[PDB]
């Protein structure tokens, strides 16, 4: 995952 927001959301 990317974004530091977990799966999906921000890449």
4 contributes a contact to a copy of itself by CB under 8 A? no
Residues 6+ apart with CB under 8 A from 1: 7, 8
User: Does 8 interact with a copy of itself (rule: CB under 8 A)?
Assistant: yes
Q: How far is the CB of 4 from Cl ion (least distance, A)?
A: 5
Widest pairwise Cα distance in the chain: 10
Task: Enumerate binding residues for a copy of itself (CB under 8 A).
Answer: 1, 6-9, 11
Task: Enumerate binding residues for Ca ion (CB under 5 A).
Answer: 1, 3, 5, 7, 9-10
């Amino acid at each position: 995952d990317x974004x530091x927001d977990g799966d999906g959301x921000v890449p």
